[PDB]
């Protein structure tokens, strides 16, 4: 018994390709489109809620996840792989940072920790790479707002705006035309909804779209009062109603 697979399942081919990483990226390509846009006073991340069945309650399945009060994540590719990554990402934010410094990690460093986990699945014994690409949007005091992409290889890049998955090629072209360095958050949400309509085929409403922002602090969502320095989470998930309001003035 015991894990006898103590050797790498991802290896270099004669051409220099890492097969399993390439194939993991192929799995991401098949995945549903998700995107992220950075504004001057915020960041927006969005994706389509592909329902497996109309009997299934798509509210119970959350593609956009809170990692810290000021950091959120969305993906394209294999959902289960994403789910466990979010669990590990939330925990590493505490163990390797908050329990040491008494504050949440900045976006770039949390991203770095998630990348490390995905890189190890590329080299460690008896495991395949993760079949997902992440888009991590976040804010911190000294770096401001930021948006990062994390690939199966463990590589990560910062973006002004980008898209991943099914119709990423067309979506990226759309974002290049619309993006400028003076975009306000509401303008970025508007563009996000426009970009996403191109890739979505069926219904396009607040129940089939999942969208969250990293913006101003939300004292109402904090849960308590009395500490002036604690002002609430910058991560907010837009409600089904809040999306439909913006779809009328589209």
């Amino acid at each position: 018994m015991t894990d006898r697979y103590s050797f790498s399942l991802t290896t270099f081919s004669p051409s220099g390709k890492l097969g399993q990483i390439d194939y993991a990226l192929t799995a991401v390509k098949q995945g549903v489109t998700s995107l992220g846009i950075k504004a001057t006073n915020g960041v927006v991340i969005a994706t389509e809620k592909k329902s497996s069945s109309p009997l299934a309650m798509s509210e119970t399945l959350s593609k956009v996840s809170l990692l810290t009060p000021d950091i959120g994540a969305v993906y394209s590719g294999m959902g289960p792989d994403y789910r466990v990554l979010v669990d590990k990402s939330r925990k590493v934010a505490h163990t390797s940072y908050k329990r040491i410094y008494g504050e949440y990690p900045p976006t770039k460093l949390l991203v770095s920790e998630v990348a490390k986990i995905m890189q190890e699945a590329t080299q460690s014994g008896g495991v395949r790479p993760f079949g997902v690409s992440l888009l991590i949007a976040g804010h911190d005091e000294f770096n401001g707002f930021s948006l990062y992409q994390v690939d199966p290889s463990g590589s990560y890049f910062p973006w002004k705006a980008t898209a991943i998955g099914k119709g990423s090629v067309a979506a990226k072209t759309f974002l290049e035309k619309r993006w400028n360095d003076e975009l306000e958050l509401e303008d970025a949400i508007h563009i996000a909804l426009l970009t996403l309509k191109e890739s979505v085929e069926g219904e396009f409403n607040g129940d089939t779209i999942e969208l969250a922002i990293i913006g101003d602090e939300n004292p109402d969502l904090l849960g308590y009062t009395g500490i002036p320095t604690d002002k609430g989470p910058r991560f907010r998930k837009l409600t089904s109603q809040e999306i439909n309001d913006r779809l009328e003035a589209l």
Binding site: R4, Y5, S6, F7, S8, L9, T10, T11, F12, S13, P14, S15, G16, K17, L18, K38, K108, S112, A115, K116, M118, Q119, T122, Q123, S124, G125, G126, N143, S146, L147, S153, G154, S155, Y156, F157, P158, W159, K160, A161, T162, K172, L175, E176, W179
Partner: protein
């Protein structure tokens, strides 16, 4: 059992080569070119970013050039994720040495240890090697300014000027042509950029597709300063040499 699926990453070919090391080097040859040039009064590190997108955030980005300590930096060529694993090890190794001896680590010692780690992955453990080649640029009070390179085999060597990644053959010929020993930093800056500009697979070399860094004694009196160039500073140095 599991024997069926073992690639056997740490074995010899009939010719006496390490398959995985050779294939990792083939991987690195497609990575963005990185150049190191050592002058008498400093060191230059120049690196070309891999096909950039216009919506990539350029100023808050780090792909090629990394800081190991205040006196030593590296240029990367290969898998960034792999490089970061090795960089954090190298950063820790430097601090261990400082903690033990109350002295900054000599460049070669840091390079040797990082290279020894790579070597281990080629001889035992059954894991794939790190698909990374480094250019180490650093200073210590024994040998002064030093350039090294290491590759997946775990073999390292010292250089006056060197390139890694893509088009090293063409790049090394151009460096070998124009390099001389009494060279200054500002001249080396110009050589580094001119070499990339000719060996680049892109149409034209621009500020947004470059990372640049210098290690001078250009601080105030007998002390070393690391300068990781900002986007606007690369834009200016590119105009100053007359490439754009």
């Amino acid at each position: 059992g599991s024997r069926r699926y073992d690639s056997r990453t740490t074995i010899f070919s009939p010719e006496g080569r390490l398959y995985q090391v050779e294939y990792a080097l083939e991987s690195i040859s497609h990575a963005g070119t990185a150049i190191g040039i050592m002058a008498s009064d400093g060191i230059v590190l120049a690196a070309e970013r891999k096909v950039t997108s216009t919506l990539l955030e350029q100023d808050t980005s780090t792909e090629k050039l990394y800081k190991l300590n205040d006196k030593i930096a590296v240029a990367v060529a290969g898998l960034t994720a792999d490089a970061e694993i090795l960089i954090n090890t190298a950063r820790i190794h430097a601090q261990n040495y400082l903690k033990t001896y109350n002295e900054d680590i000599p460049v070669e010692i840091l390079v040797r240890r990082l290279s020894d780690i790579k070597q281990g992955y080629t001889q035992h453990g059954g894991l794939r090697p790190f698909g990374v080649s480094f250019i180490y640029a650093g200073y210590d009070d024994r040998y002064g300014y030093q350039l090294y390179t290491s590759n997946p085999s775990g073999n390292y060597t010292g250089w006056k000027a060197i390139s890694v990644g893509a088009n090293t053959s063409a790049a090394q010929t151009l460096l070998q042509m124009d390099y001389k020993d009494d060279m200054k930093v500002d001249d080396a800056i110009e050589l580094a950029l001119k070499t990339l500009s000719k060996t680049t697979d892109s149409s034209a070399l621009t500020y947004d597709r470059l990372e640049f860094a210098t290690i001078r004694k250009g601080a105030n009196d007998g002390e070393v300063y690391q300068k990781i160039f900002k986007p606007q500073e690369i834009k200016d140095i590119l105009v100053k040499t007359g490439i754009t």
